[PDB]
Ligand binder design. Sequence first.
Ligand SMILES: *[C@@H]1O[C@H](CO)[C@@H](O[C@@H]2O[C@H](CO)[C@@H](O)[C@H](O)[C@H]2NC(C)=O)[C@H](O)[C@H]1NC(C)=O
Ligand SMILES: CN[C@]1(c2ccccc2Cl)CCCCC1=O
Ligand SMILES: *[C@@H]1O[C@H](CO)[C@@H](O)[C@H](O)[C@H]1NC(C)=O
Ligand SMILES: N[C@@H](CCC(=O)O)C(=O)O
Lengths: 150, 50, 182, 147, 238, 79, 93, 43
Amino acid sequence: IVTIHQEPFVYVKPTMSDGTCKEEFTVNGDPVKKVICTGPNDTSPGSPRHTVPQCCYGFCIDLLIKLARTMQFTYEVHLVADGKFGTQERVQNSNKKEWNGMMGELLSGQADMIVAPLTINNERAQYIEFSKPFKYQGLTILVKKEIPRS
Amino acid sequence: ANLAAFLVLDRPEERITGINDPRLRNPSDKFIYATVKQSSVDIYFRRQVE
Amino acid sequence: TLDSFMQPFQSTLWLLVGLSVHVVAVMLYLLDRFSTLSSAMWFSWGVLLNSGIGEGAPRSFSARILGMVWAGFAMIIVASYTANLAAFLVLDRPEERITGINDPRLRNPSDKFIYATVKQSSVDIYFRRQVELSTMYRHMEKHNYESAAEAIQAVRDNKLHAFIWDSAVLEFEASQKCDLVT
Amino acid sequence: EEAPFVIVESVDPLSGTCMRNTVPCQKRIISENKTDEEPGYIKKCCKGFCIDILKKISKSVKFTYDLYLVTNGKHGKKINGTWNGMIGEVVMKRAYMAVGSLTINEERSEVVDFSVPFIETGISVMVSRSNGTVSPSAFLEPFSADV
Amino acid sequence: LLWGLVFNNSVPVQNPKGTTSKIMVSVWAFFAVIFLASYTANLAAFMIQEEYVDQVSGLSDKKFQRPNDFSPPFRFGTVPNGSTERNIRNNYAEMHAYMGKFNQRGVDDALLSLKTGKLDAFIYDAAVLNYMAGRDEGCKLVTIGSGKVFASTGYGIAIQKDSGWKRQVDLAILQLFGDGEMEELEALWLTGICHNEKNEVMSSQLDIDNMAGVFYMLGAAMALSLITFICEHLFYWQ
Amino acid sequence: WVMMFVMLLIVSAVAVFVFEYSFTIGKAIWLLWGLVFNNSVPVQNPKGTTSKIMVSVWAFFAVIFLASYTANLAAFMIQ
Amino acid sequence: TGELFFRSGFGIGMRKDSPWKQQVSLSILKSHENGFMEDLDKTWVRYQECDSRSNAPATLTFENMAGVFMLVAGGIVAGIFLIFIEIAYKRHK
Amino acid sequence: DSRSNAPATLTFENMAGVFMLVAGGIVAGIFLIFIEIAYKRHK
Ligand SMILES: *[C@@H]1O[C@H](CO)[C@@H](O[C@@H]2O[C@H](CO)[C@@H](O)[C@H](O)[C@H]2NC(C)=O)[C@H](O)[C@H]1NC(C)=O
Ligand SMILES: CN[C@]1(c2ccccc2Cl)CCCCC1=O
Ligand SMILES: *[C@@H]1O[C@H](CO)[C@@H](O)[C@H](O)[C@H]1NC(C)=O
Ligand SMILES: N[C@@H](CCC(=O)O)C(=O)O
């Protein structure tokens, strides 16, 4: 599996020294499942990137565990190389064009699923196949709130 | 009474209608907006000429 | 304008309020003898009315704690009454005014909304040529009138809901009789 | 016919047909039970949101179509091990497709193939608004507990 | 004297004879006047614009889970032979049998019965209910909350299994979203008059259910008063 | 306002001949007038039960009216 | 601010002609109707601590208290001096 | 020229519902004079 750091869906935290990260409980004392992630640190990939084990928890992979429960298949999640969702560009001024992002790993045999927020559009539907959406959303604008009147 | 008038009324200061707002359609140099590079938002804007 | 007394409160509240005033007056007499019926009756009933009549006061410490809080309940009733009357004189019932030619009522005509113009006019030319308003022309051509002066009379008698015509003529008509509006 | 998705109209009495921005569709009627009537139909035409969607799809990808209204049983319901309705029509050949209001669920999506949804729906509760407001402790609402 | 003077000048009292005592009460009275005026307004501002709350939460509530265990039994209905009934049957077996007597016939009949008063709640598809609530004679009907759907699904095109046209149909449908004709179609065919932005109904007459708090505080004051009186009398008995 | 003033005079005369069965005329007018305006002015209250009953309803009238007026005057600011 | 203009949904991306194509789609549809999906929304997405409403009419706070309570307090510290003046003037005339 | 808001200067319409009560006490107060003078002589 290949995922991406996204605040509401996939949390990323450093692991503890011993190799297993922290135990956590919710507001009602419900244990939170965690999966070991092998992603590169130093979020800016300009410097030589070295893979380091981490652990993730959030909305997407919790859904993944129950989904993997029924099909009886194991898994091992890692993080995308450069943190890009994926667009189709042109390289080296040639007649061949290739994808750049987490879509490249899926096509080039380095992955089998993308359990991550990845919207459906016409461009990506001609190469990969999408399942029925599990969450409907849209685009919007975020601005800073004004000052209250004294 | 005056006190009540001062409390009740306030100015929202035209807090952006949406994608058809005149502040966005023809942008000046006093308003800046941007998104994440290489995302599905880029595909939506680039594909249509309008 | 308002129902001077009936608008701000129910009829059932007043009897409860009036009875509640009589409840404490009985209690104030009880505390005096246990540790002046007319005088005690004047006090509690007087305080809520804000009028200054009577010289009797609770000398014992028993009613001092109860008397002070009773005065507080007097002001909260009047203060809420003033705010409520202000709220009723400012707000208004919601209503829908035709925003223009793109309003949903005109774009998708129902069986209870009727509008028409003057037959053989420039308005008929405008609607016929355009294609996007084809569904609107059919509804209009069945109820069109003969003259502008006759059509305005129909709106007054509630035989027609809307009338489309030049603004120069209609703007003059609204001022003369302001039971219509544009 | 259902909702503002498909609206069924009546034929113009003058020309025996109906106007533009509409697709002619023919709804079958059964009159006699003692002796059933063979190919006896009536002609109508219907319009709506799904009709416009179908028109645009047909303009984009080239194919021809001919609508015809359902016979019985509303949308569809598995009754004693046999479907009826729109799903019953499509599952038993001679329909090949189905448009209109038809939700997507696990049980119904095991005998047909669904496309990408073009609208979001669900289950909602609808009640009549009461001509009142809420203010249980409005007297204590202003000010602060410390002053 | 001070507690009477602050609360708008009610109870009689004997004023002090001294001059500096007369001076202090003057500024205290000025403070009391300022105080009171502000409170009144403030209350007018809070009351003028107050948002309303629907008296039901969702499908997990005491009104729905326990229908009879309430004041006048709660009545609601669903048109049968549909997806909503099938979904309700699987997950809520107990409350399915309670709506058997209230099965309606059509959407128009259900709306008429809701207007008359035969029903109190309706369960059906959200997309059609939004349109029907947004286009009505008057603004009597509401859609609950802000439109919190419970079983999020979508409308689709049914095609025969194992056919080649599915990919082309899906691509053609996905094309429309990118170029924006879906927005135009939804604006033309699905817009309504109302918008449900929590407008002021302009409430009236201040029913007893509001001042229950202030009468409760008055009763609590009375209770503490006679409690303190009994305690003080028994202490002074010795 | 003018009919309020004339009815104030009428009610003053009413209280006059009710008390007839040191409070005769001027003092009483002054008291009633003072009573409308938030009871600001010090007064000399009468000592008759019927007079008290008569004053109470006027009191009521005063309280209702003052409330109207503030509210009503607030509407101009808000519109 | 504003409404939504580009409407789509998040999906599980898989390669074409994959054996997991059929099973994954059925599992997601089952999760919606049985109520498991909305349970995740409450735990991870749905909890509001900031104030709602646009105008948000807020009650006055102590900031008003400082502007008014200090004034009456200032009279107290200034009224004690005037008492000395009065008693001094009492014996001075 | 009333536009649509049209703040209303309240007329005598409200005065009827309030002045009747206070005026009513006048004819209701003379009646209780008789019982008042009778009670003084009776007791
Ligand atoms: C829901 O489906 C049932 C199917 O059992 C319908 O019941 C039939 O309705 C038809 C038409 O009125 C009758 O001719 C049959 O005799 C009924 N069958 C039985 C077993 O009673 C029912 O009418 C449908 N309801 C709605 C609202 O569509
Ligand atoms: C300060 N006394 C007030 C009042 C007191 C008593 C009755 C009515 C009123 Cl309106 C309080 C509220 C507004 C100003 C005013 O006259
Ligand atoms: C149900 O099963 C089959 C049709 O699916 C039929 O043989 C049988 O009679 C049906 N039962 C009834 C009661 O119709
Ligand atoms: N739209 C529903 C039918 C109506 C309903 O169940 O509410 C379906 O596709 O089955």
